[PDB]
Design an enzyme around this catalytic site. Structure first.
Site, PDB file in Angstrom:
ATOM      1  N   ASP A 195      20.664  23.746  26.665  1.00 15.56           N
ATOM      2  CA  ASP A 195      19.464  24.337  26.090  1.00 15.56           C
ATOM      3  C   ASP A 195      18.545  25.100  27.087  1.00 15.56           C
ATOM      4  OD1 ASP A 195      17.196  24.837  24.489  1.00 15.56           O
ATOM      5  OD2 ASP A 195      17.408  22.932  23.434  1.00 15.56           O
ATOM      6  N   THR A 196      18.595  26.426  27.053  1.00 20.06           N
ATOM      7  CA  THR A 196      17.759  27.226  27.935  1.00 20.06           C
ATOM      8  C   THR A 196      16.294  27.215  27.514  1.00 20.06           C
ATOM      9  OG1 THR A 196      18.240  29.245  26.689  1.00 20.06           O
ATOM     10  CG2 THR A 196      19.632  28.762  28.595  1.00 20.06           C
ATOM     11  N   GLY A 197      16.035  26.966  26.236  1.00 20.23           N
ATOM     12  CA  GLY A 197      14.662  26.938  25.757  1.00 20.23           C
ATOM     13  C   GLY A 197      13.994  25.589  25.950  1.00 20.23           C
TER      14      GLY A 197
HETATM   15  C1  MK1 Z   1      11.838  19.849  25.907  1.00 16.96           C
HETATM   16  C2  MK1 Z   1      12.097  20.091  24.425  1.00 16.96           C
HETATM   17  C3  MK1 Z   1      13.522  19.606  24.051  1.00 16.96           C
HETATM   18  C4  MK1 Z   1      10.976  19.305  23.731  1.00 16.96           C
HETATM   19  N1  MK1 Z   1      11.950  21.513  24.119  1.00 16.96           N
HETATM   20  C5  MK1 Z   1      12.002  22.006  22.857  1.00 16.96           C
HETATM   21  O1  MK1 Z   1      12.387  21.379  21.870  1.00 16.96           O
HETATM   22  C6  MK1 Z   1      11.544  23.446  22.716  1.00 16.96           C
HETATM   23  C7  MK1 Z   1      10.075  23.491  22.273  1.00 16.96           C
HETATM   24  N2  MK1 Z   1       9.601  24.881  22.079  1.00 16.96           N
HETATM   25  C8  MK1 Z   1       8.304  24.771  21.402  1.00 16.96           C
HETATM   26  C9  MK1 Z   1       7.148  24.531  22.366  1.00 16.96           C
HETATM   27  C10 MK1 Z   1       6.300  23.412  22.207  1.00 16.96           C
HETATM   28  C11 MK1 Z   1       5.207  23.204  23.074  1.00 16.96           C
HETATM   29  C12 MK1 Z   1       5.021  24.169  24.095  1.00 16.96           C
HETATM   30  N3  MK1 Z   1       5.834  25.229  24.231  1.00 16.96           N
HETATM   31  C13 MK1 Z   1       6.874  25.436  23.415  1.00 16.96           C
HETATM   32  C14 MK1 Z   1      10.455  25.574  21.114  1.00 16.96           C
HETATM   33  C15 MK1 Z   1      11.901  25.527  21.568  1.00 16.96           C
HETATM   34  N4  MK1 Z   1      12.378  24.144  21.706  1.00 16.96           N
HETATM   35  C16 MK1 Z   1      13.704  24.411  22.302  1.00 16.96           C
HETATM   36  C17 MK1 Z   1      14.925  24.181  21.388  1.00 16.96           C
HETATM   37  O2  MK1 Z   1      15.928  24.711  22.025  1.00 16.96           O
HETATM   38  C18 MK1 Z   1      15.330  22.740  21.018  1.00 16.96           C
HETATM   39  C19 MK1 Z   1      16.422  22.567  19.954  1.00 16.96           C
HETATM   40  C20 MK1 Z   1      16.874  21.118  19.771  1.00 16.96           C
HETATM   41  C21 MK1 Z   1      17.900  20.991  18.664  1.00 16.96           C
HETATM   42  C22 MK1 Z   1      19.118  21.693  18.683  1.00 16.96           C
HETATM   43  C23 MK1 Z   1      19.995  21.632  17.584  1.00 16.96           C
HETATM   44  C24 MK1 Z   1      19.619  20.845  16.469  1.00 16.96           C
HETATM   45  C25 MK1 Z   1      18.417  20.104  16.446  1.00 16.96           C
HETATM   46  C26 MK1 Z   1      17.566  20.189  17.564  1.00 16.96           C
HETATM   47  C27 MK1 Z   1      15.929  23.088  18.647  1.00 16.96           C
HETATM   48  O3  MK1 Z   1      14.816  22.788  18.213  1.00 16.96           O
HETATM   49  N5  MK1 Z   1      16.841  23.804  18.000  1.00 16.96           N
HETATM   50  C28 MK1 Z   1      16.654  24.081  16.588  1.00 16.96           C
HETATM   51  C29 MK1 Z   1      16.098  25.379  16.236  1.00 16.96           C
HETATM   52  C30 MK1 Z   1      15.112  26.106  16.898  1.00 16.96           C
HETATM   53  C31 MK1 Z   1      14.654  27.289  16.272  1.00 16.96           C
HETATM   54  C32 MK1 Z   1      15.174  27.688  15.003  1.00 16.96           C
HETATM   55  C33 MK1 Z   1      16.184  26.943  14.352  1.00 16.96           C
HETATM   56  C34 MK1 Z   1      16.637  25.776  15.005  1.00 16.96           C
HETATM   57  C35 MK1 Z   1      17.694  24.776  14.478  1.00 16.96           C
HETATM   58  C36 MK1 Z   1      17.992  24.195  15.828  1.00 16.96           C
HETATM   59  O4  MK1 Z   1      18.826  25.067  16.382  1.00 16.96           O
END
Ligand code: MK1
Lengths: 99, 99
Positions: A25-27
Site C-alpha cells: 500500500d503506497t497510500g
Molecule cells: C495507515 C492507513 C492504513 C490508516 N492508511 C490509510 O488507510 C489511508 C488513509 N487515507 C486517508 C487519510 C486519513 C487521515 C489523514 N490523511 C489521509 C486514505 C488512503 N488510505 C490508504 C488506503 O490505501 C488503505 C486501503 C486499505 C484496504 C485495502 C483493500 C480493502 C480494504 C481496505 C483502502 O482503504 N483501500 C480501499 C479503498 C480506498 C479508496 C477507494 C476504494 C477503496 C476500496 C479499498 O480499495
C-alpha cells in the site's frame, strides 16, 4: 521484480515464522496488520482511513520479511480486514512507483 | 517518473481545468476525489476502507490528467481527507511497483 496494478498487489510476508498475505500500500503511511499478539510494549494509537478511525496497538522495531527481503519498522496492529504494508516498510525494500 | 516512498506520493492532477493534489494509492481499488462538483449524472456506490464504509457518488467517463498523462475513467466523489487516485486510473497511465 515489477508488480502491475490490474489486480491488488498482494505479496507473502513472514511475520515471526507465520506466512501471511499482505497488500503493498503506497497510500498507507503505516503498516497495519491483523489483530494478533506481538512481543513487546505497545502504545494505543488512533489511525483514520476511509470509513473512520480505529484503535490500534503500536509496536516499535519489528521485522517482517516482505517478499524475501528483511525489513525492520514500526507495526500497528488492529481490527483491519487486510494486512497493509505501508510506506515505512516499503522504502526499506527500495520500492518505487514508475510510470 | 520514478517516485520513491520516503514522502507521500503526491502528484498534480488537472480535473475540470483546475489543479489539485492527489495521492497515488496502490492499496485503493477506486479513485476517490474529495467533495467537488462534477458534470453529469451520478450513481450510488459504497466503498469501504479502514474504519468502515462510506457513501460516495460515482460518476463515469471523467477526463483527468495525472501528472501530464491523460486518463478517462470512473471517479468517486465522497467525504475523503485526501484526493485518492486508485488502481482503476493507475493502470491507464501504466503505473507499476518496482523493486
Ligand atoms: C495507515 C492507513 C492504513 C490508516 N492508511 C490509510 O488507510 C489511508 C488513509 N487515507 C486517508 C487519510 C486519513 C487521515 C489523514 N490523511 C489521509 C486514505 C488512503 N488510505 C490508504 C488506503 O490505501 C488503505 C486501503 C486499505 C484496504 C485495502 C483493500 C480493502 C480494504 C481496505 C483502502 O482503504 N483501500 C480501499 C479503498 C480506498 C479508496 C477507494 C476504494 C477503496 C476500496 C479499498 O480499495
Amino acid at each position: 521484480p515489477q508488480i502491475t496494478l490490474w489486480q491488488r498487489p498482494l505479496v507473502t510476508i513472514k511475520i515471526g515464522g507465520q506466512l501471511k498475505e499482505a497488500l503493498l500500500d503506497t497510500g498507507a503511511d503505516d503498516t497495519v496488520l491483523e489483530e494478533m499478539s506481538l512481543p513487546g510494549r505497545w502504545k494505543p494509537k488512533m489511525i483514520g482511513g476511509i470509513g473512520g478511525f480505529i484503535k490500534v496497538r503500536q509496536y516499535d522495531q519489528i521485522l517482517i520479511e516482505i517478499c524475501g527481503h528483511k525489513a525492520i519498522g514500526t507495526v500497528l496492529v488492529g481490527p483491519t480486514p487486510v494486512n497493509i504494508i505501508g510506506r515505512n516498510l516499503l522504502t526499506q525494500i527500495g520500492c518505487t512507483l514508475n510510470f
